Design a protein. Structure first.
Lengths: 7, 426
């Protein structure tokens, strides 16, 4: 699982 | 105005001999990579900007460019395995580990996030992040007397990254690394934040998904009672990982399963086996099937908690996958149980749903069901009540299904069905 930092 | 730059302009700014122009271009890149609609990760990689960002990570005298490059690299590493590999190939792992010690909380948080994405790629990058020495500084970030003093999002990101360091198999995380991380995980498992608890349970579920030696490592820390407490939580994001962990623990030894039973886990299964979420029901029935495969006193604990009627209910009506797990639980129950326990199972009304499930199109369920039939028939023989059971199976239409299974593709299916027809219905 990866997470993109949108804000 | 760092909004909507072109990759060409970003390259121009980053290639300038001006730290501030580089900072502005790096921020523009970050904003480009932080757009929900198709971030141009591949275009940024092809421009050769990863080594520049990695070098910016080390500019201690310009913390803003450190933060912007860390954010940009975090989003690049969030993509495909090839894109995460591109980030790792630039030397980002040691640079991010160094940033973990930054006096700016938001920069260290970004480094934690980035390392989480890299470790989350798979076992190889997970172990490489560990080899570069990330666990020590990561755990040092949590070395405070009370975790409530730390910012919520900060603690959540740290927990998520640690969970990714416990994740993935073939191979599993190094034993020494697991022992290093487990005490902090236990502490996070008692924090009041729902997301921290969910990710801590997910980490424990990863660590318990393995051989009994791994399960024993977790169970020795005394986290089973807390897992059961969280199993009774209202937040589904917490119950799901807690049930997976408890289910992973009961796949081990009968003593580890007993530690789960002693914590009071069975008292929660009335609600789990009727949970409106199909996956909770399936996972709970799978846990029950692994509990009914234990000792006879453990089957008796299942009986005393009134869970046999709930297994009958799940076998009568549920998602087919849950019904399969229930059939497994019944076959394990009948294989290890006493005649009295198998008699109680029949008295609870298992025969009719067991029969109705023999019309399925899954060979495995039919084998499982037919093996449970054999075990119940053996118990009837021991009691001299084979005729009674025969009449019962005939009254609910099971005989027709078994006779029709004598003409079935699978051999084990027609041999067992034909052995039953010849031994008890002739």
């Amino acid at each position: 699982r990866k997470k993109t930092s949108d804000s | 105005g760092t909004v909507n730059w072109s990759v060409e302009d970003i390259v121009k700014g980053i290639n300038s001999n001006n730290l501030e122009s580089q900072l502005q271009a790096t921020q523009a890149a970050r904003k480009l990579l932080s757009r929900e609609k198709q971030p141009p990760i591949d275009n940024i990689i092809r421009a050769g900007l990863i080594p520049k960002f990695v070098s910016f990570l080390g500019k201690t005298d310009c913390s803003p460019i450190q933060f912007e490059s860390a954010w940009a690299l975090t989003n690049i590493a969030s993509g495909t395995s090839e894109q995460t590999k591109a980030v790792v190939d630039g030397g980002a792992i040691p640079a991010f580990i160094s940033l973990l010690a930054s006096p700016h909380a938001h920069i260290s948080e970004q480094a934690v996030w980035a390392l989480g994405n890299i470790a989350g790629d798979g076992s190889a990058f997970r172990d490489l992040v560990i080899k570069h020495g990330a666990i020590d500084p990561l755990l040092a970030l949590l070395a405070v007397p009370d975790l409530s003093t730390l910012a919520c999002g900060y603690l959540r990101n740290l927990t998520w990254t640690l969970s990714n360091l416990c994740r993935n198999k073939n191979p599993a995380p190094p034993l020494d690394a697991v022992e290093q991380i487990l005490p902090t995980l236990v502490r996070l498992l008692h924090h009041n934040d729902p997301e921290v608890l969910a990710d801590s349970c997910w980490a424990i579920s990863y660590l318990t998904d393995g051989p009994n030696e791994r399960i024993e490592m977790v169970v020795k820390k005394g986290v089973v009672p807390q897992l059961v407490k969280l199993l009774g939580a209202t937040e589904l994001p917490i119950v799901t990982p807690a049930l997976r962990a408890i289910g992973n623990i009961v796949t081990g030894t009968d003593e580890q399963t007993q530690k789960v039973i002693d914590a009071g886990a069975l008292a929660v299964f009335p609600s789990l086996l009727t949970n409106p979420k199909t996956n909770i029901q399936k996972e709970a029935t799978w846990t029950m099937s692994n509990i009914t495969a234990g000792r006879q006193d453990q089957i008796q604990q299942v009986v005393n908690h009134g869970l046999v009627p709930f297994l009958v209910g799940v076998l009568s009506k549920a998602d087919f996958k849950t019904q399969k797990e229930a059939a497994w639980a019944i076959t394990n129950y009948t294989s290890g149980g006493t005649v009295e326990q198998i008699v109680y199972l029949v008295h609870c009304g298992i025969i009719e749903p067991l029969m109705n499930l023999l019309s399925a199109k899954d060979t495995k369920i039919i084998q499982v069901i037919l093996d449970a039939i054999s075990n119940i028939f053996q118990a009837a023989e021991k009691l001299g009540e084979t005729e009674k059971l025969s009449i019962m199976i005939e009254e609910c239409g099971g005989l027709d299904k078994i006779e029709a299974l004598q003409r079935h593709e699978n051999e084990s299916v027609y041999k067992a069905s034909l052995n039953l027809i010849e031994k008890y219905f002739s």
